[PDB]
Design a protein around this ligand. Sequence first.
Ligand SMILES: [Ca+2]
Ligand SMILES: [Ca+2]
Ligand SMILES: [Ca+2]
Length: 204
Amino acid sequence: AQYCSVNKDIFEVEENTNVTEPLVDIHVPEGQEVTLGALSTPFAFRIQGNQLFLNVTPDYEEKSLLEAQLLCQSGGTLVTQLRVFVSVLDVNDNAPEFPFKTKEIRVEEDTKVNSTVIPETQLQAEDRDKDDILFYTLQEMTAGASDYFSLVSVNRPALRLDRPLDFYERPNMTFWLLVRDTPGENVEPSHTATATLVLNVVPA
Ligand SMILES: [Ca+2]
Ligand SMILES: [Ca+2]
Ligand SMILES: [Ca+2]
């Protein structure tokens, strides 16, 4: 019983969790001392009273894996070394953001029905939760607008022309574009962003 040990060396910690309590007791044989080695993730861990602590609140978007190198020395010479891993778990802690608030697109009256008029690249939002699937909804602001345009799908926000345009009858169509980072509208956590789309019909 003359080797350093830990009973647990893989920890899962949700990002934004403050862990003040020890992760683990380090069993140190009489005559040895344990310190953090230089392969340890910088500014993450400390050892006090032969216990390993997290000093910081993890952020999955900054770093998803934290490593502690435990060096077990006797008179300053290395006897053994242990690794401890903290696997950081992603939380939905970022809101999707559109790169615009209100935006206008001009569309020729004779645009072919079923044409893409705004590609996904011009409408898509970005969410710093890289794994979040974004769900897009189009809501008419001016009555009848949804008769003319729709999104290709809730996850592919390309705007498609669905019916022939008529400059005289309806030269302006305005929409609310909503994005959320959850499939469900009423779940928690869920973040929503909104933008306005103005479709201006140009005549022949
Ligand atoms: Ca984060
Ligand atoms: Ca996150
Ligand atoms: Ca998110």
